[PDB]
């Protein structure tokens, strides 16, 4: 039948008051195209109710229109809505469509309701398509674009629930397509060389954690945690960087950087039993190193404690005979006491406890290790990355994790040790050099595979991640584990915590 | 009659008096509350303190300069 509704005024309303009145191609004036918002399914999945599809009046309803709205600034007229729905013999159910009048705002509404607007009731059966008139209904003159604007709206419900039969097939599902054409009423307002204007945002790589390579210390990525037992603001120097690309610290690009260095070594005679090498540091793609802006050469080790290298002779080309030899290095602050790597110069002993010229230093394992950052400039103040944070009340890191071998001495041991993001994130930010627009992102983190939503969390624009926990209490999550950019996000935006994965619920 | 003005003080600790005798008194708020990451502003002076072989600087820290107490309470 038709719908309940008195024919609504076209161009005539805004002809004393818009600077021009402008009239479209008759070919499209009566040409049913599919809207861009022009398809929707039907499955047993949905239940009586679920929204199909909400539209709401605009030139954007319509390919050619929409071309049109780069041009022109405003528009007023009716539309003209046409529904297709290839169903089957087996698939039984009736859909609503219902013109929501603007200014009613949004509610939930129950099937009932959805009847109690001009609408039209369909089976899922028919071969022939709908035709639904999508009427202007103004309270001002005339609309500019802006889609902030309240227009008339059609929104497609199930009316009552699915049900297929035969040899239930829950695969299929019921294809719709929704098409339109501007009445006749339809005209564009001023002629705007509006032609073109568009932005950007952030992505993040749909790489799992446990593929992911450590920013800290150069292994694999194990481990995806939080701990509100551990140090809350973390002073890494390795692993930083801000989502709009800046790289902090002694952050490199390459994860074969981490916690390594290279040098020119000697051994001099302060003691007289040259068991010291010293290493006068140069930067790992073998450049000279001078002290800058960040507190030692790119990759150098930012936590404490007495790390054992291996120190080959640089390779250059084939043939570079090659010596290696292992030494123990104390990377923390005493005592009287020295070690710049600000400066430039480090001492390791032969763990007498062979080479010289040009060498590399790869980290073998640690001894003691803490989780403070040496004393970089001995004594003296040295450019740092900041502490990471600040966190919301009950918000904590998100700790990306990998062991280190601890040594012993009797006992080797799988120590832990965190960083903020994998590597692959570091360089991913470092070279979109995106831009950033507000305080930080919403994230999900989320199984693909599975489609769980594990949970959400905050990346600062500053480049660590958290989450709202109370617990005490490490809670360590599943690393196969992707990340989905959410949103931008104020930085008091509240995240969700949590719950008793149990969901039964009685009537009572 | 008599005025008493402060000389030193000995144990300090920046916690308020009791200062009726175990019954609940009228007392301005805690200062508060603040964002998270948010902190109080401090302006400090240092009050003798004494021992007793040994006078020392000791630091104690009010919300806003007097200046500015006046000046608010003045303008309303």
């Given at each position: 039948?038709?719908?309940?509704?008195?024919?609504?005024?076209?161009?005539?309303?805004?002809?004393?008051?818009?600077?021009?009145?402008?009239?479209?191609?008759?070919?499209?004036?009566?040409?049913?195209?599919?809207?861009?918002?022009?398809?929707?399914?039907?499955?047993?999945?949905?239940?009586?109710?679920?929204?199909?599809?909400?539209?709401?009046?605009?030139?954007?309803?319509?390919?050619?229109?929409?071309?049109?709205?780069?041009?022109?600034?405003?528009?007023?007229?009716?539309?003209?809505?046409?529904?297709?729905?290839?169903?089957?013999?087996?698939?039984?159910?009736?859909?609503?469509?219902?013109?929501?009048?603007?200014?009613?705002?949004?509610?939930?509404?129950?099937?009932?309701?959805?009847?109690?607007?001009?609408?039209?009731?369909?089976?899922?059966?028919?071969?022939?398509?709908?035709?639904?008139?999508?009427?202007?209904?103004?309270?001002?003159?005339?609309?500019?674009?802006?889609?902030?604007?309240?227009?008339?709206?059609?929104?497609?419900?199930?009316?009552?629930?699915?049900?297929?039969?035969?040899?239930?097939?829950?695969?299929?599902?019921?294809?719709?397509?929704?098409?339109?054409?501007?009445?006749?009423?339809?005209?564009?307002?001023?002629?705007?060389?509006?032609?073109?204007?568009?932005?950007?945002?952030?992505?993040?790589?749909?790489?799992?954690?446990?593929?992911?390579?450590?920013?800290?210390?150069?292994?694999?990525?194990?481990?995806?945690?939080?701990?509100?037992?551990?140090?809350?603001?973390?002073?890494?120097?390795?692993?930083?960087?801000?989502?709009?690309?800046?790289?902090?610290?002694?952050?490199?690009?390459?994860?074969?950087?981490?916690?390594?260095?290279?040098?020119?070594?000697?051994?001099?005679?302060?003691?007289?039993?040259?068991?010291?090498?010293?290493?006068?540091?140069?930067?790992?793609?073998?450049?000279?190193?001078?002290?800058?802006?960040?507190?030692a050469p790119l990759g150098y080790p930012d936590f404490?404690?007495?790390?054992?290298?291996?120190?080959?002779?640089?390779?250059?080309?084939?043939?570079?005979?090659?010596?290696?030899?292992?030494?123990?290095?104390?990377?923390?602050?005493?005592?009287?006491?020295?070690?710049?790597?600000?400066?430039?110069?480090?001492?390791?002993?032969?763990?007498?406890?062979?080479?010289?010229?040009?060498?590399?230093?790869?980290?073998?394992?640690?001894?003691?290790?803490?989780?403070?950052?040496?004393?970089?400039?001995?004594?003296?103040?040295?450019?740092?990355?900041?502490?990471?944070?600040?966190?919301?009340?009950?918000?904590?890191?998100?700790?990306?994790?990998?062991?280190?071998?601890?040594?012993?001495?009797?006992?080797?041991?799988?120590?832990?040790?965190?960083?903020?993001?994998?590597?692959?994130?570091?360089?991913?930010?470092?070279?979109?050099?995106?831009?950033?627009?507000?305080?930080?992102?919403?994230l999900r983190y989320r199984n693909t595979l599975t489609?769980?939503?594990?949970?959400?969390?905050?990346?600062?624009?500053?480049?660590?991640?958290?989450?709202?926990?109370?617990?005490?209490?490490?809670?360590?999550?599943?690393?196969?584990?992707?990340?989905?950019?959410?949103?931008?996000?104020?930085?008091?935006?509240?995240?969700?915590?949590?719950?008793?994965?149990?969901?039964?619920?009685?009537?009572?």
């Amino acid at each position: 039948d038709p719908l309940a509704m008195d024919p609504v005024a076209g161009s005539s309303t805004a002809v004393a008051t818009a600077g021009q009145v402008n009239p479209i191609d008759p070919w499209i004036i009566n040409n049913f195209v599919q809207a861009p918002q022009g398809e929707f399914t039907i499955s047993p999945n949905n239940t009586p109710g679920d929204v199909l599809f909400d539209l709401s009046l605009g030139p954007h309803l319509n390919p050619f229109l929409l071309h049109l709205s780069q041009m022109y600034n405003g528009w007023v007229g009716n539309m003209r809505v046409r529904i297709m729905l290839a169903g089957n013999a087996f698939t039984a159910g009736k859909i609503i469509v219902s013109c929501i009048p603007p200014g009613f705002g949004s509610h939930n509404l129950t099937i009932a309701q959805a009847t109690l607007f001009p609408h039209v009731i369909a089976d899922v059966r028919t071969l022939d398509p709908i035709e639904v008139p999508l009427e202007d209904v103004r309270n001002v003159l005339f609309h500019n674009n802006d889609r902030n604007q309240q227009t008339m709206r059609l929104v497609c419900m199930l009316y009552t629930p699915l049900r297929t039969g035969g040899g239930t097939g829950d695969s299929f599902v019921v294809a719709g397509r929704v098409m339109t054409c501007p009445s006749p009423d339809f005209n564009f307002l001023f002629l705007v060389p509006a032609a073109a204007a568009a932005a950007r945002m952030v992505d993040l790589p749909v790489i799992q954690p446990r593929l992911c390579t450590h920013a800290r210390w150069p292994a694999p990525v194990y481990g995806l945690l939080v701990d509100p037992s551990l140090p809350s603001n973390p002073q890494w120097q390795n692993g930083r960087v801000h989502v709009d690309g800046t790289l902090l610290g002694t952050t490199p690009i390459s994860g074969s950087w981490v916690s390594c260095f290279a040098a020119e070594a000697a051994y001099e005679f302060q003691s007289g039993t040259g068991e010291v090498a010293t290493f006068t540091l140069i930067e790992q793609d073998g450049s000279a190193y001078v002290p800058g802006d960040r507190a030692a050469p790119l990759g150098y080790p930012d936590f404490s404690g007495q790390l054992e290298i291996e120190v080959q002779t640089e390779t250059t080309k084939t043939g570079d005979k090659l010596k290696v030899t292992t030494f123990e290095m104390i990377l923390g602050p005493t005592t009287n006491a020295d070690q710049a790597p600000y400066q430039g110069r480090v001492f390791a002993s032969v763990t007498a406890a062979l080479v010289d010229g040009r060498v590399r230093a790869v980290p073998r394992s640690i001894y003691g290790f803490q989780d403070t950052i040496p004393e970089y400039n001995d004594g003296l103040l040295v450019p740092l990355a900041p502490p990471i944070g600040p966190f919301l009340p009950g918000e904590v890191l998100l700790r990306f994790r990998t062991y280190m071998r601890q040594i012993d001495t009797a006992d080797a041991a799988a120590e832990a040790i965190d960083c903020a993001l994998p590597q692959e994130f570091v360089s991913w930010f470092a070279s979109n050099a995106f831009t950033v627009q507000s305080e930080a992102l919403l994230l999900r983190y989320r199984n693909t595979l599975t489609g769980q939503l594990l949970f959400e969390c905050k990346l600062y624009n500053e480049g660590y991640i958290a989450l709202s926990y109370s617990g005490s209490g490490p809670l360590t999550f599943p690393t196969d584990g992707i990340f989905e950019v959410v949103s931008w996000v104020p930085r008091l935006y509240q995240l969700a915590s949590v719950g008793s994965l149990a969901t039964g619920r009685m009537l009572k």
